[PDB]
Design a protein around this nucleic acid. Structure first.
Lengths: 132, 189, 56, 61, 69, 314
RNA sequence: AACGAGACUCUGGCAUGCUAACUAGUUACGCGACCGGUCGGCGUAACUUCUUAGAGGGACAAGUGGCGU
């Protein structure tokens, strides 16, 4: 079959990671830039690097890939990670406590908290999985 | 427009069985002027279904060792047979070829299972492509075996079995093997 | 491959040397191995911020 | 009687030496009978099989 | 046989090139589709040539008969 | 008001239609270079079942023909390809007459002069080659042309002082003084490489697009970034329009025709009604062509065909 | 990380594109011969399709559609 060995895949991964701006989807202009960037002993390896690159550039539009790391995604993930909402998800006016949680807060002298709305506790003591 | 050997046309040839329709060639666009085509039919599986079955019969005509390369020998054997067929019947001689290939191939074989010397077979189906493959084999070895030490030539011996397989007679070597290949097949079932 | 004649008999000596690269200013072969792909280290593209029309 | 058939999907290739393909066989009488049969020879999907006893079952030989 | 299949290929490839060089492309297409529809070996060369013999046998693939004990 | 409609496709190629050239002297022949090594003379019947028929294929190239151009009269052509050659053609009998060798990389584009005697070409050798009408090169450029390839070279068809301009893959539109071989103006304004340069018919406004997707146009007399036209994906090609005063810009799968002084995208130009093969990429639009009257717009696509666009005045 | 595998080297296949051919030719022109035909018969020129052999191209699972966490 047609499996690409570690030489083609290692070279293709570094040449994506360093020169992502020049590479696109055409295998032919990928081959014309993979022979100007790199010094490959010639064509039958040059067309195999440029073909895995042409299969690897289509794999970058659909999301990240678990090897290489390129700085058009890794700025978008950075701006996705520095994302705070306007009002936090911990600012709830009605938070729900059990009966016994309120007793722990009264031990911690937090029975004067106004936002707590004690729920009705569960009527059945049914939590274990039915063994057998 | 396209007549085999420039004389026999293909428009009135009518395959009977639905089992062999997609596999047996010419009716429509496999019409060739000659059985010699020199094409790469063995390059993939199932590709030889799309070759004209006149070339199939020509190719299996040259089986034994002293005739193994001779294609221009066997195409004139088939051409001279297609005169004797037309004389002895009076119709188009391609309808009798598909009548012989429809009739001659078995429809239930036995697959061999046992030990070294022990035979306990079992009956299975027959794929229609193996039916086409084993039709032409029985026809051609019947023509080969009954022309060996005999004054009859190969063109007469091919034609006098290529009609006897169309008529379903049991004097032809082909139908004599098909009914026994199904008789020993039913005997296990 | 060479021979030695000792006291007791003959020895053979086989010596293989894998030579290195560095195109021949006196040493080694010119071309690299057929699987050694080298990649030119990119000088980074400087970031184009505002359209400057440099009429020179 | 004799019954004419069709091929839905080829399942796998069984037999002592792998000579038998095992095939999921539809009938041609608009029947919902999807019998499994043992066919000897080259088969692809969309064939037209021809059986003699149309009530047999697929084993592994 | 190999020169018959070379003559009929060059007749076809000559008429197609004449109709391309001194007639229009449309007539070249209406020739080429019938020539391709009959048999593609009237325009495209057959690229298979004889393999080389190897020691150990009488030809390319076949090997000499071996014996035991 | 003015829309863009389909009348048919010109299906005669096998590779990507790389670049189209049209002539105003002949309203019937279209010349479209391609990536199946052949340039095809078209003939426009404009009936219902064939808008265009091929007439005479021009075959001299051993690789992908990149850029074709027709002379000031409808009898000479000029082209280049990715084998480092330029083939001067003849439209009457359909052959070559001159062959321009001297490049060491892929000839990317070739521009034709108004006086039909100055032949310029840009290659992947980071060099620009200036020719006669015969074949001896006059001056080859190593005046720090670009640090990388030269993707498109175009003349300026102005009644004023002419100029020669050439973009590149180093984000730069360099302006050159013809017959004196010297720089005039740099434009450090593009992110990512470029693909094309077109020049307006007055000879004042050049356009230039690339991987940024934004047609950043400049001025040829003083060098101002006038309008920042926006697009989606890559700009494969750009061309102007003399009558309607527009700027034909290329999206990937579609075409963006723009009002220039108004900066309104007026039409979208695409055709996808299929759904079982739309899981992949839609085909790009590689080239653009504007004829004499401007009623017709031709585009070079990746389904090996050329689509015609009609300006329905409504 | 190293070797072996693969890459690699020779060979087959393609090129009316490049380089050139009296120790390979084709086409054309006269001559000659026998009935516009036939010349592997004779000499000039246009040129490399056929013949040679060099560089460089060309095929990568690249394209489309299915199946694959």
């Amino acid at each position: 079959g047609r499996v690409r060995t570690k030489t083609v895949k290692k070279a293709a991964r570094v040449i994506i990671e360093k020169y992502y701006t020049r590479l696109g989807n055409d295998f032919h202009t990928n081959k014309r830039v993979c022979e100007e960037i790199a010094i490959i002993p010639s064509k039958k390896l040059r067309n195999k690097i440029a073909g895995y690159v042409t299969h690897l550039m289509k794999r970058i539009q659909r999301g990240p890939v678990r090897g290489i790391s390129i700085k058009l995604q890794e700025e978008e993930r950075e701006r996705r990670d520095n994302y705070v909402p306007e009002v936090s998800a911990l600012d709830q006016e009605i938070i729900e406590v059990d009966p016994d949680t309120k007793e722990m807060l009264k031990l911690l002298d937090f029975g004067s908290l106004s936002n707590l709305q004690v729920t009705q506790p569960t009527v059945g003591m049914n939590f274990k999985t039915p063994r057998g | 427009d396209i007549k085999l050997f420039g004389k026999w046309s293909t428009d009135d040839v009518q395959i009977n069985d639905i089992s062999l329709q997609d596999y047996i060639a010419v009716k429509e666009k496999y019409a060739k002027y000659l059985p010699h085509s020199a094409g790469r039919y063995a390059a993939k599986r199932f590709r030889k279904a799309q070759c004209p079955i006149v070339e199939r019969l020509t190719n299996s005509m040259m089986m034994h060792g002293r005739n193994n390369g001779k294609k221009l020998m066997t195409v004139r054997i088939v051409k001279h047979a297609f005169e004797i067929i037309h004389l002895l019947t009076g119709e188009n001689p391609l309808q009798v070829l598909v009548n012989a290939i429809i009739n001659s191939g078995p429809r239930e074989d036995s697959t061999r299972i046992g030990r070294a010397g022990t035979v306990r077979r079992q009956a299975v189906d027959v794929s229609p492509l193996r039916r086409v493959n084993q039709a032409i084999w029985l026809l051609c070895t019947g023509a080969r075996e009954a022309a060996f030490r005999n004054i009859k030539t190969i063109a007469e011996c091919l034609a006098d079995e290529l009609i006897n397989a169309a008529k379903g007679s049991s004097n032809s070597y082909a139908i004599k093997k098909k009914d026994e290949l199904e008789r020993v097949a039913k005997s296990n079932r | 491959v060479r021979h030695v004649l000792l006291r007791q008999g003959v020895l053979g000596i086989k010596v293989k040397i894998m030579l290195p690269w560095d195109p021949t200013g006196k040493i080694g072969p010119k071309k690299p191995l057929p699987d050694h792909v080298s990649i030119v280290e990119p000088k980074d593209e400087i970031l184009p911020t505002t359209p400057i029309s440099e009429q020179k | 009687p004799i019954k004419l058939a069709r091929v839905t999907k080829v399942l796998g290739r069984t037999g002592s030496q792998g000579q038998c393909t095992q095939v999921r066989v539809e009938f041609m009488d608009d029947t919902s009978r999807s019998i499994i049969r043992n066919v000897k020879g080259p088969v692809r999907e969309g064939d037209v099989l021809t059986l003699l006893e149309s009530e047999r079952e697929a084993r592994r030989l | 046989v190999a020169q018959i299949y070379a003559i009929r290929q060059s007749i076809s490839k000559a008429l197609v090139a004449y109709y391309q060089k001194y007639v229009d492309e449309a007539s070249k297409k209406e020739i080429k589709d019938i020539l391709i529809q009959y048999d593609r070996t009237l325009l495209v060369a057959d690229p298979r040539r004889c393999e080389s013999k190897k020691f150990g046998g009488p030809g390319a693939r076949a090997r000499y008969q071996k014996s035991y004990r | 008001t003015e829309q863009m409609t389909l009348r048919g496709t010109l299906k005669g190629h096998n590779g990507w239609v790389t670049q189209i050239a049209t002539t105003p002297q002949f309203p019937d022949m279209i010349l479209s270079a391609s990536r199946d090594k052949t340039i095809i003379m078209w003939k426009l019947t404009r009936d219902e079942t064939n808008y265009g028929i091929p007439q005479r294929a021009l075959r001299g190239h051993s690789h992908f023909v990149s850029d074709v151009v027709i002379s000031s009269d409808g009898q000479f052509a000029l082209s280049g390809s990715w084998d480092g050659t330029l083939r001067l053609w003849d439209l009457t009998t359909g052959t070559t007459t001159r062959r321009f060798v001297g490049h060491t990389k892929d000839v990317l584009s070739v521009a034709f002069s108004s006086d039909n005697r100055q032949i310029v070409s840009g290659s992947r050798d980071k060099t620009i080659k200036l020719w006669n009408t015969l074949g001896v090169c006059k001056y080859t450029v190593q005046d720090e042309s670009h640090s990388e390839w030269v993707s498109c070279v175009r003349f300026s068809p102005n009644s004023s002082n002419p100029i020669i301009v050439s973009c590149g893959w180093d984000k730069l539109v360099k302006v050159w003084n013809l017959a004196n071989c010297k720089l005039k103006t740099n434009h450090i304004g593009h992110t990512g490489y470029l693909n094309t340069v077109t020049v307006s018919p007055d000879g004042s406004l050049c356009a230039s697009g690339g991987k940024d997707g934004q047609a950043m146009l400049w001025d040829l007399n003083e060098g101002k970034h006038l309008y920042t036209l926006d697009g989606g994906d890559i700009i494969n090609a750009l061309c102007f329009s003399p009558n309607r005063y527009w700027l034909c810009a290329a999206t990937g799968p579609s075409i963006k025709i723009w009002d220039l002084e108004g900066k309104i995208i007026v039409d979208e130009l695409k055709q996808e009604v299929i759904s079982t093969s739309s899981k992949a990429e839609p085909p790009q639009c590689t080239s653009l062509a504007w004829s004499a009257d401007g009623q017709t717009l031709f585009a070079g696509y990746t389904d090996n065909l050329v689509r015609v666009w009609q300006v329905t005045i409504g």
